[PDB]
Amino acid sequence: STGSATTTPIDSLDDAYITPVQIGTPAQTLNLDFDTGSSDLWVFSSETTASEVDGQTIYTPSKSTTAKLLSGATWSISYGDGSSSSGDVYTDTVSVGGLTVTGQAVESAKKVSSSFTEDSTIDGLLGLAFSTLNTVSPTQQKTFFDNAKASLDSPVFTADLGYHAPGTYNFGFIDTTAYTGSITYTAVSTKQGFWEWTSTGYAVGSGTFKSTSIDGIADTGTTLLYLPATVVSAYWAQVSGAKSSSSVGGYVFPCSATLPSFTFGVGSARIVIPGDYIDFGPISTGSSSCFGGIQSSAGIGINIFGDVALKAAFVVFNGATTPTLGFASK
Protein backbone atom coordinates (compact mmCIF):
# COMPACT_ATOMS: atom_id res chain seq x y z
CA SER A 1 0.00 0.00 0.00
CA THR A 2 0.94 3.70 -0.31
CA GLY A 3 -0.52 7.06 0.71
CA SER A 4 0.01 10.63 -0.57
CA ALA A 5 -1.35 13.80 1.07
CA THR A 6 -0.81 17.51 0.40
CA THR A 7 0.58 19.64 3.33
CA THR A 8 -0.27 23.36 3.42
CA PRO A 9 1.34 26.23 5.36
CA ILE A 10 -0.98 27.65 8.11
CA ASP A 11 0.01 31.29 7.38
CA SER A 12 2.15 33.58 5.16
CA LEU A 13 5.36 32.79 7.20
CA ASP A 14 5.22 28.90 7.00
CA ASP A 15 4.93 28.85 10.85
CA ALA A 16 3.66 25.23 10.52
CA TYR A 17 2.04 22.90 7.96
CA ILE A 18 -1.33 21.12 8.15
CA THR A 19 -2.31 17.85 6.42
CA PRO A 20 -5.90 16.52 6.26
CA VAL A 21 -6.45 13.22 8.12
CA GLN A 22 -9.64 11.09 8.09
CA ILE A 23 -10.62 9.68 11.54
CA GLY A 24 -13.54 7.35 12.26
CA THR A 25 -16.61 6.01 10.43
CA PRO A 26 -18.10 7.96 8.75
CA ALA A 27 -14.87 9.96 8.24
CA GLN A 28 -14.24 13.07 10.36
CA THR A 29 -11.52 15.14 8.58
CA LEU A 30 -9.14 17.03 10.90
CA ASN A 31 -6.12 19.15 9.84
CA LEU A 32 -3.11 17.82 11.78
CA ASP A 33 0.48 19.04 12.20
CA PHE A 34 2.71 16.13 11.10
CA ASP A 35 5.59 16.17 13.61
CA THR A 36 8.76 14.00 13.08
CA GLY A 37 9.90 15.27 16.56
CA SER A 38 7.09 13.57 18.61
CA SER A 39 5.21 10.26 18.72
CA ASP A 40 1.56 11.07 19.81
CA LEU A 41 -1.45 11.39 17.46
CA TRP A 42 -3.71 13.70 19.52
CA VAL A 43 -6.78 15.74 18.50
CA PHE A 44 -9.09 18.45 19.71
CA SER A 45 -12.30 16.61 20.63
CA SER A 46 -15.84 16.65 22.09
CA GLU A 47 -14.00 16.04 25.44
CA THR A 48 -11.79 19.22 25.22
CA THR A 49 -12.57 21.87 27.94
CA ALA A 50 -15.03 24.19 26.10
CA SER A 51 -13.11 27.42 27.03
CA GLU A 52 -9.90 25.91 25.41
CA VAL A 53 -11.58 25.38 21.95
CA ASP A 54 -11.54 28.50 19.64
CA GLY A 55 -12.41 27.54 16.03
CA GLN A 56 -10.66 24.11 15.75
CA THR A 57 -12.46 21.15 14.15
CA ILE A 58 -13.11 18.50 16.86
CA TYR A 59 -13.17 14.68 16.77
CA THR A 60 -16.39 13.31 18.32
CA PRO A 61 -15.81 9.61 19.14
CA SER A 62 -19.50 9.01 19.99
CA LYS A 63 -20.33 9.70 16.25
CA SER A 64 -17.82 7.06 14.98
CA THR A 65 -19.10 3.47 14.70
CA THR A 66 -15.46 2.21 14.77
CA ALA A 67 -14.29 4.19 17.88
CA LYS A 68 -13.50 2.14 21.03
CA LEU A 69 -12.39 3.65 24.39
CA LEU A 70 -8.93 2.28 25.26
CA SER A 71 -9.90 1.56 28.86
CA GLY A 72 -7.66 3.11 31.53
CA ALA A 73 -5.27 4.77 29.08
CA THR A 74 -4.23 8.41 29.55
CA TRP A 75 -1.65 10.67 27.90
CA SER A 76 0.18 13.92 28.73
CA ILE A 77 2.83 15.70 26.64
CA SER A 78 5.02 18.81 26.91
CA TYR A 79 6.77 20.21 23.81
CA GLY A 80 10.10 22.08 23.47
CA ASP A 81 8.19 25.42 22.99
CA GLY A 82 6.52 25.07 26.47
CA SER A 83 3.10 24.01 25.08
CA SER A 84 1.22 20.95 26.41
CA SER A 85 -1.90 18.78 26.15
CA SER A 86 -3.40 15.74 27.89
CA GLY A 87 -6.44 13.46 27.85
CA ASP A 88 -7.73 9.90 27.33
CA VAL A 89 -7.48 7.49 24.35
CA TYR A 90 -9.66 5.82 21.69
CA THR A 91 -8.73 3.36 18.95
CA ASP A 92 -10.24 4.15 15.55
CA THR A 93 -9.67 3.92 11.78
CA VAL A 94 -7.23 6.62 10.56
CA SER A 95 -6.47 7.34 6.85
CA VAL A 96 -3.83 9.68 5.37
CA GLY A 97 -3.85 10.30 1.60
CA GLY A 98 -5.61 6.94 0.87
CA LEU A 99 -3.48 4.85 3.30
CA THR A 100 -5.66 3.31 6.10
CA VAL A 101 -4.66 1.99 9.58
CA THR A 102 -7.28 0.20 11.72
CA GLY A 103 -6.96 0.26 15.53
CA GLN A 104 -4.80 3.43 15.59
CA ALA A 105 -4.51 5.10 19.02
CA VAL A 106 -6.28 8.51 18.72
CA GLU A 107 -5.42 10.54 21.85
CA SER A 108 -8.45 12.76 22.70
CA ALA A 109 -7.52 16.08 24.44
CA LYS A 110 -9.30 17.00 27.67
CA LYS A 111 -6.87 19.94 28.22
CA VAL A 112 -4.67 22.00 25.83
CA SER A 113 -2.32 24.93 26.65
CA SER A 114 -3.02 28.46 25.45
CA SER A 115 -0.79 28.32 22.32
CA PHE A 116 -2.96 25.44 20.95
CA THR A 117 -6.26 27.25 21.77
CA GLU A 118 -4.95 30.42 20.08
CA ASP A 119 -4.10 28.59 16.80
CA SER A 120 -7.52 27.91 15.14
CA THR A 121 -5.83 26.25 12.08
CA ILE A 122 -4.25 23.18 13.88
CA ASP A 123 -6.76 20.51 15.02
CA GLY A 124 -4.01 18.30 16.57
CA LEU A 125 -0.66 16.58 15.95
CA LEU A 126 0.32 13.36 14.17
CA GLY A 127 3.68 12.20 15.54
CA LEU A 128 6.25 10.50 13.21
CA ALA A 129 9.24 10.08 15.59
CA PHE A 130 9.94 6.61 17.09
CA SER A 131 7.18 4.94 19.15
CA THR A 132 9.52 4.79 22.21
CA LEU A 133 8.54 8.51 22.83
CA ASN A 134 4.75 7.84 22.82
CA THR A 135 3.29 9.16 26.14
CA VAL A 136 0.26 6.78 26.55
CA SER A 137 0.14 5.11 30.00
CA PRO A 138 0.04 2.39 31.16
CA THR A 139 0.35 0.76 27.69
CA GLN A 140 2.53 2.76 25.26
CA GLN A 141 1.00 3.05 21.71
CA LYS A 142 2.50 2.93 18.20
CA THR A 143 2.65 5.84 15.70
CA PHE A 144 0.61 5.83 12.48
CA PHE A 145 3.83 5.05 10.51
CA ASP A 146 4.78 2.17 12.82
CA ASN A 147 1.24 0.64 12.46
CA ALA A 148 1.28 1.13 8.62
CA LYS A 149 4.91 -0.02 8.01
CA ALA A 150 4.38 -3.76 7.39
CA SER A 151 1.60 -2.99 4.79
CA LEU A 152 3.63 -0.37 2.87
CA ASP A 153 5.32 -1.13 -0.49
CA SER A 154 8.62 0.15 1.11
CA PRO A 155 9.02 1.02 4.86
CA VAL A 156 9.53 4.79 4.23
CA PHE A 157 7.80 8.14 4.33
CA THR A 158 8.97 11.36 2.64
CA ALA A 159 8.59 15.06 3.53
CA ASP A 160 8.56 17.59 0.68
CA LEU A 161 7.66 20.90 2.38
CA GLY A 162 7.01 24.01 0.25
CA TYR A 163 8.40 27.56 0.71
CA HIS A 164 5.30 29.76 0.95
CA ALA A 165 3.48 26.94 -1.01
CA PRO A 166 1.89 23.51 -0.46
CA GLY A 167 3.99 20.35 -0.39
CA THR A 168 3.56 16.60 0.06
CA TYR A 169 3.88 13.75 2.57
CA ASN A 170 4.18 10.34 0.87
CA PHE A 171 4.00 6.92 2.66
CA GLY A 172 5.49 3.73 1.22
CA PHE A 173 7.23 5.06 -1.94
CA ILE A 174 9.87 7.55 -3.15
CA ASP A 175 8.56 9.83 -5.95
CA THR A 176 11.65 9.99 -8.27
CA THR A 177 10.04 13.04 -10.06
CA ALA A 178 10.01 15.16 -6.84
CA TYR A 179 13.80 15.88 -6.53
CA THR A 180 16.92 16.71 -8.65
CA GLY A 181 20.17 14.71 -8.74
CA SER A 182 20.53 11.80 -6.26
CA ILE A 183 19.37 11.14 -2.66
CA THR A 184 22.31 11.06 -0.16
CA TYR A 185 21.61 8.73 2.78
CA THR A 186 23.11 9.28 6.26
CA ALA A 187 23.10 7.29 9.54
CA VAL A 188 20.43 7.72 12.24
CA SER A 189 20.67 7.19 16.02
CA THR A 190 17.31 6.23 17.59
CA LYS A 191 18.77 6.38 21.17
CA GLN A 192 16.76 9.56 22.06
CA GLY A 193 13.64 8.45 20.04
CA PHE A 194 14.29 11.10 17.30
CA TRP A 195 15.46 11.06 13.65
CA GLU A 196 18.95 12.08 14.93
CA TRP A 197 21.80 12.43 12.42
CA THR A 198 25.14 14.24 11.99
CA SER A 199 25.61 16.99 9.40
CA THR A 200 29.11 17.27 7.92
CA GLY A 201 29.29 21.11 8.14
CA TYR A 202 28.08 24.43 6.77
CA ALA A 203 28.73 27.47 4.64
CA VAL A 204 27.36 31.06 4.87
CA GLY A 205 26.43 32.59 1.48
CA SER A 206 29.25 32.18 -1.09
CA GLY A 207 31.75 31.48 1.75
CA THR A 208 34.00 28.42 2.09
CA PHE A 209 32.49 25.23 3.51
CA LYS A 210 33.52 24.49 7.13
CA SER A 211 33.88 20.73 7.76
CA THR A 212 32.50 20.10 11.27
CA SER A 213 30.16 17.44 12.79
CA ILE A 214 26.74 18.88 13.86
CA ASP A 215 24.52 16.29 15.60
CA GLY A 216 20.80 17.20 15.36
CA ILE A 217 17.23 16.01 14.66
CA ALA A 218 15.11 16.22 11.52
CA ASP A 219 11.93 17.79 13.03
CA THR A 220 8.97 18.84 10.80
CA GLY A 221 7.12 20.11 13.92
CA THR A 222 9.72 22.85 14.62
CA THR A 223 9.52 26.03 12.47
CA LEU A 224 13.14 27.28 12.62
CA LEU A 225 16.74 25.97 12.25
CA TYR A 226 18.44 25.77 15.71
CA LEU A 227 22.26 25.34 15.57
CA PRO A 228 25.29 25.88 17.86
CA ALA A 229 25.94 29.50 18.87
CA THR A 230 29.29 29.54 16.92
CA VAL A 231 27.54 28.65 13.64
CA VAL A 232 24.61 31.06 14.24
CA SER A 233 27.01 33.99 15.13
CA ALA A 234 28.98 33.28 11.88
CA TYR A 235 25.72 33.49 9.84
CA TRP A 236 24.33 36.72 11.38
CA ALA A 237 27.74 38.48 11.24
CA GLN A 238 27.19 38.56 7.42
CA VAL A 239 23.97 40.70 7.84
CA SER A 240 24.54 44.43 8.61
CA GLY A 241 22.69 45.47 11.77
CA ALA A 242 21.77 41.90 12.89
CA LYS A 243 21.92 41.31 16.65
CA SER A 244 20.82 38.87 19.34
CA SER A 245 17.96 40.53 21.33
CA SER A 246 17.26 39.10 24.84
CA SER A 247 13.97 41.13 24.92
CA VAL A 248 12.71 39.61 21.64
CA GLY A 249 14.20 36.09 22.30
CA GLY A 250 16.78 35.63 19.51
CA TYR A 251 18.52 37.15 16.48
CA VAL A 252 16.72 40.04 14.74
CA PHE A 253 17.79 41.89 11.62
CA PRO A 254 16.75 45.03 9.69
CA CYS A 255 13.76 44.25 7.47
CA SER A 256 15.60 46.21 4.68
CA ALA A 257 18.37 43.49 4.54
CA THR A 258 18.96 40.93 1.78
CA LEU A 259 19.84 37.67 3.63
CA PRO A 260 22.63 35.29 2.54
CA SER A 261 21.96 31.63 1.89
CA PHE A 262 22.98 28.91 4.39
CA THR A 263 24.38 25.55 3.23
CA PHE A 264 24.43 22.34 5.35
CA GLY A 265 26.32 19.12 4.57
CA VAL A 266 24.83 15.64 4.21
CA GLY A 267 27.83 13.39 3.76
CA SER A 268 29.70 14.76 0.70
CA ALA A 269 26.45 16.43 -0.55
CA ARG A 270 25.21 19.97 0.15
CA ILE A 271 21.68 21.42 0.74
CA VAL A 272 21.36 25.17 0.09
CA ILE A 273 18.72 27.17 2.08
CA PRO A 274 18.04 30.38 0.10
CA GLY A 275 18.28 33.59 2.15
CA ASP A 276 14.55 34.38 1.74
CA TYR A 277 13.72 31.12 3.65
CA ILE A 278 15.45 32.67 6.75
CA ASP A 279 13.14 35.78 6.88
CA PHE A 280 10.29 35.42 9.49
CA GLY A 281 9.07 39.02 9.10
CA PRO A 282 8.43 41.89 11.51
CA ILE A 283 8.78 41.08 15.28
CA SER A 284 5.45 42.97 15.78
CA THR A 285 3.02 44.40 13.24
CA GLY A 286 4.61 47.47 11.49
CA SER A 287 8.10 46.98 13.02
CA SER A 288 11.22 47.41 10.85
CA SER A 289 12.98 44.72 13.02
CA CYS A 290 12.56 41.24 11.49
CA PHE A 291 12.92 37.83 13.20
CA GLY A 292 15.60 35.45 11.96
CA GLY A 293 14.97 31.86 10.91
CA ILE A 294 18.38 30.57 12.12
CA GLN A 295 18.64 30.68 15.95
CA SER A 296 20.97 29.33 18.66
CA SER A 297 20.25 25.89 20.16
CA ALA A 298 22.39 26.73 23.24
CA GLY A 299 19.31 26.86 25.63
CA ILE A 300 17.64 23.64 24.12
CA GLY A 301 20.20 20.83 24.60
CA ILE A 302 19.87 19.60 20.98
CA ASN A 303 20.35 21.00 17.44
CA ILE A 304 17.07 21.05 15.42
CA PHE A 305 16.84 20.84 11.62
CA GLY A 306 13.31 22.27 11.52
CA ASP A 307 11.15 23.44 8.61
CA VAL A 308 13.60 26.23 7.50
CA ALA A 309 16.16 23.49 6.69
CA LEU A 310 13.84 20.64 5.65
CA LYS A 311 11.76 22.72 3.15
CA ALA A 312 15.02 23.23 1.12
CA ALA A 313 15.20 19.40 0.52
CA PHE A 314 13.29 16.26 -0.41
CA VAL A 315 13.68 14.24 2.80
CA VAL A 316 13.40 10.41 3.11
CA PHE A 317 12.58 8.95 6.54
CA ASN A 318 13.73 5.34 5.99
CA GLY A 319 12.13 3.06 8.64
CA ALA A 320 14.00 -0.14 7.63
CA THR A 321 15.30 -2.38 10.48
CA THR A 322 18.33 0.02 10.62
CA PRO A 323 16.72 3.46 10.01
CA THR A 324 18.47 6.09 7.85
CA LEU A 325 17.69 9.63 6.52
CA GLY A 326 17.98 10.70 2.90
CA PHE A 327 18.32 14.25 1.54
CA ALA A 328 18.05 15.47 -2.08
CA SER A 329 18.01 18.93 -3.65
CA LYS A 330 14.75 19.86 -5.47
Swiss-Prot record:
<dbReference type="GO" id="GO:0006508">
    <property type="term" value="P:proteolysis"/>
</dbReference>
<keyword id="KW-0645">Protease</keyword>
<keyword id="KW-1015">Disulfide bond</keyword>
<keyword id="KW-0732">Signal</keyword>
<dbReference type="GO" id="GO:0004190">
    <property type="term" value="F:aspartic-type endopeptidase activity"/>
</dbReference>
<feature type="disulfide bond">
    <location>
        <begin position="255"/>
        <end position="290"/>
    </location>
</feature>
<feature type="active site">
    <location>
        <position position="35"/>
    </location>
</feature>
<feature type="active site">
    <location>
        <position position="199"/>
    </location>
</feature>
<feature type="domain" description="Peptidase A1">
    <location>
        <begin position="17"/>
        <end position="328"/>
    </location>
</feature>
<keyword id="KW-0378">Hydrolase</keyword>
<comment type="similarity">
    <text>Belongs to the peptidase A1 family.</text>
</comment>
<protein>
    <recommendedName>
        <fullName>Endothiapepsin</fullName>
        <ecNumber>3.4.23.22</ecNumber>
    </recommendedName>
</protein>
<keyword id="KW-0064">Aspartyl protease</keyword>
<keyword id="KW-0865">Zymogen</keyword>
